[PDB]
Specification:
homodimer, alpha/beta, four-stranded mixed β-sheet, 13% strand, DNA-binding, dna binding protein/dna, CRISPR, Cas1
DNA sequence: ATGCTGGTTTTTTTT
DNA sequence: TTTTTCCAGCATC
């Protein structure tokens, strides 16, 4: 239920969001937004970003060939235990590997068997992807030639690649939305590592092949012109039909089901225990 | 001209329009148009009354800068704008220390040692921190010339507390906002608390406690010494003036850096 | 439909 | 000669 705004002023109007363009004033209820995508020629006010962050909404600045910038709130969860579970899973090598296995395995339509050697799955994924690219290139009619990322080549982005990248930007925005709205951290990456938003990519990879590739190929099969926008429409139709944002939330919760384990008391750490917070102690 | 702390510089902008102007930041306010060099800019702090442009965030994202939507004087923290170039080595170090009981205990003892010499105990140190808080309370109750510390508040009822209690709580909120700002501006997590574990802002409280006894308590007691009308606002004003007179953000960032050094 | 004014409705060694 | 000069709700009739 995300919303894309370009060439408009976004401010807080009447306790909600107001987008001022040449058409006048459009008011949008912030209840179901998830992501507010700001295209080029857009200015937003401190109050609008404050309200969106407070309502557990993320702001994603997408561009005309640029980087990715995400505005991050504080989440809908009051004091997330989910984050403590994420940190414990990330910090323990065995649980870490288990989460990595989970993330790789969830990308296959037909579920896999239990006996399946590690680092083989990480290679099996690769053929799926490649065969999905080939499947939709044969289906639509658009030649593939591979993705624009490789080594030793700065081959120009063909339209399908550009559609892939735009839809990827939007999918990453939604991934960030669900991650920070459920109280997780984008920085605790399991497959992607080193960046404060790695987990976003970890989550988005689970739905790239299911939603992005068909939308991009179907958009380039008809257009080859103005894809960056029509891919957004096709991806919107595919996300609000499969109820992705809810599915993502479900996967984010169920993803950590292995190890162990109001709203203003507090706490106090002890060795494998905790004392009550907010009390005087000494003599 | 913009002040740096250790490495990159930072900027607080309020009551202005932020645009990109000539490969840099352009600030349109009542004073006109001001140029800020984006080259090596860690955090750009947006106060209320600032609206930004798609081009400005594009330029900031390309240069690896983060934006922090904060309240007036950074007493409140509202939102973080980050890009994909932001490194998470400090965050990984904090998490690794937090998840291992030995390193966890070591960092907790660091945090305790920063508020005082030392002693040698396990669960009495909590009582010693208690006694420190209480006798500092008593000191500033005497010097201010007022009632006692007490600290009797009800979360459900704001006005069901002492005037000094309300001032104390307001100042605590201000310190928590500034702590949250400095914590996430250096790339750490507010939820990875070593003391106060269990809250998503535990580390914020951990950091704010390091400066409560030096900034919050005297400000609250002296504000109640001024009057008992609008204490909540006066204490915040006096704390703002005392934070800008003591460069508390730089000290906070420096201590946060040294907190995970050599562990 | 026009001045104004405050920058957000707080608390985590309280019980 | 190629825009940006604080934003938004409160109080008043």
């Amino acid at each position: 239920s995300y919303l894309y705004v370009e060439h408009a002023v976004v401010e807080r109007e009447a306790g909600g969001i107001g987008i001022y363009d040449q058409e006048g004033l459009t008011l949008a209820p912030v209840a179901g937004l998830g992501v507010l995508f700001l295209g080029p020629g857009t200015r937003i006010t401190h109050a609008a970003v404050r309200l969106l962050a407070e309502n557990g909404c993320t702001v994603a600045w997408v561009g005309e060939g640029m980087a990715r910038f995400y505005a991050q709130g504080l989440g809908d969860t009051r004091s997330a235990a989910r984050f403590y579970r994420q940190a414990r899973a990330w910090a323990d090598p065995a649980l870490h590997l288990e989460v990595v296995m989970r993330l790789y395995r969830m990308r296959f339509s037909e579920p896999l068997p239990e006996g399946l050697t590690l680092e083989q799955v990480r290679g099996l994924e690769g053929v799926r992807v490649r065969n999905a690219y080939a499947r939709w290139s044969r289906e639509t009619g658009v030649p593939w030639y591979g993705r624009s990322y490789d080594r030793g080549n700065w081959r120009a982005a063909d339209p399908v690649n550009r559609a892939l990248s735009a839809g990827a930007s939007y999918l990453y925005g939604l991934a960030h939305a669900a991650i920070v709205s459920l109280g997780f951290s984008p920085a605790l990456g399991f497959i992607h590592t080193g960046k404060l938003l790695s987990f976003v990519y970890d989550i988005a990879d689970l739905y790239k092949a299911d939603y992005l590739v068909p939308a991009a190929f179907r958009t380039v099969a008809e257009s080859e012109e103005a894809v960056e926008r029509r891919v957004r429409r096709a991806l919107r139709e595919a996300i609000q039909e499969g109820r992705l944002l809810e599915r993502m939330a479900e996967d984010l919760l169920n993803l950590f089901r292995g190890l162990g384990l109001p709203t203003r008391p507090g706490g106090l750490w002890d060795l494998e225990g905790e004392v009550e917070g907010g009390v005087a102690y000494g003599g």
